From Swiss-Prot, chain A:
Biological source species: Homo sapiens
UniProt feature coiled coil, ranges: none
Expressed in which tissues: Expressed at low levels in brain, colon, lung, peripheral blood leukocytes, placenta, small intestine, and thymus. Expressed at high levels in heart, kidney, liver, skeletal muscle and spleen. Overexpressed in a significant proportion of breast cancers.
EC code: 3.2.2.-
Gene: DNPH1
Induction line: Expression is induced by ETV1.
Annotated GO biological process: allantoin metabolic process; deoxyribonucleoside monophosphate catabolic process; dGMP catabolic process; epithelial cell differentiation; nucleoside salvage; positive regulation of cell growth; purine nucleotide catabolic process
Residues of the full protein shown: 20 to 159 of 174
Quaternary structure and partners: Monomer and homodimer.
Function: Part of a nucleotide salvage pathway that eliminates epigenetically modified 5-hydroxymethyl-dCMP (hmdCMP) in a two-step process entailing deamination to cytotoxic 5-hydroxymethyl-dUMP (hmdUMP), followed by its hydrolysis into 5-hydroxymethyluracil (hmU) and 2-deoxy-D-ribose 5-phosphate (deoxyribosephosphate). Catalyzes the second step in that pathway, the hydrolysis of the N-glycosidic bond in hmdUMP, degrading this cytotoxic nucleotide to avoid its genomic integration.
Name of the featured protein: 5-hydroxymethyl-dUMP N-hydrolase
Length: 141, 135
């Protein structure tokens, strides 16, 4: 009955504010089964070069979860190759996509991502750190 | 006869990146035509971010090889590689470990040593390596 929800976010974004990713995923649990290899990706990344096979396994498993997901939820405040790639695969798999961007960070969101948005299937919601639960509530109701 | 090549990478910095990008583009020009190389964009003023996205995808679809410099984190570049995989393009990613950065596991993990390769390199050898790949 509940939709499957993939979550990822830059490894830098999660380290700079540990609470945020926890709150996003916690609130998503109100609304569906969450899939994410975020923690694994963070750790294997750190390990770097010698974690090659672990990278392969993560790629394959995230790819599996992207295919299972009904909604892909991406925190796109910090630049990330991995999040970008997932979104690209997600677009090719015809998923519904919700990107969460913090404009206060003083970054500007990639034009590739903004230009992908159509405000229906692919939405980008600009939010402030303290309103992320209200935002997810609005989207999933 | 002459393949069409897509090249992108996040230029964030001063001269060294710009120069590295120009060195890679100039080497790619020897093997084929670089679609992506032909202030504020005229594209956004003409048709917003949507037109930019459509132009990049147009070039992606036309390309025979996609080349990504993936040292610097980039949503855009990631997204291009994601779309490119879906089109079954040949992909070459170029990573510089001496940057200090750590390559996303998703990108590292995509490598299959045929259609998706990830080569590590040092700034001084990128010419020789592109030679190895295209010859
Ligand atoms: Cl805001
Ligand atoms: Cl970016
Ligand atoms: Cl490879």
């Amino acid at each position: 009955m509940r939709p499957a929800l993939f979550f990822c976010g830059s490894i830098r974004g999660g380290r700079e504010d540990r609470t945020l990713y926890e709150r996003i995923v916690s609130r998503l649990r109100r609304f569906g089964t969450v899939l994410t290899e975020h923690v694994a990706a963070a750790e294997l990344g750190a390990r770097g070069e010698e974690a090659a096979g672990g990278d392969r396994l993560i790629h394959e498993q995230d790819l599996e979860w992207l295919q299972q997901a009904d909604v892909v939820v991406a925190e796109v405040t910090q630049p990330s190759l991995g999040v970008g790639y997932e979104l690209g695969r997600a677009v090719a798999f015809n998923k519904r996509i919700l990107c969460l961007f913090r404009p206060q960070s003083g970054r500007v969101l990639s034009a590739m991502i903004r230009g992908a948005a159509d405000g229906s299937r692919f939405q980008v919601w600009d939010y402030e750190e303290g309103e992320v639960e209200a935002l997810l509530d609005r989207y999933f109701e």
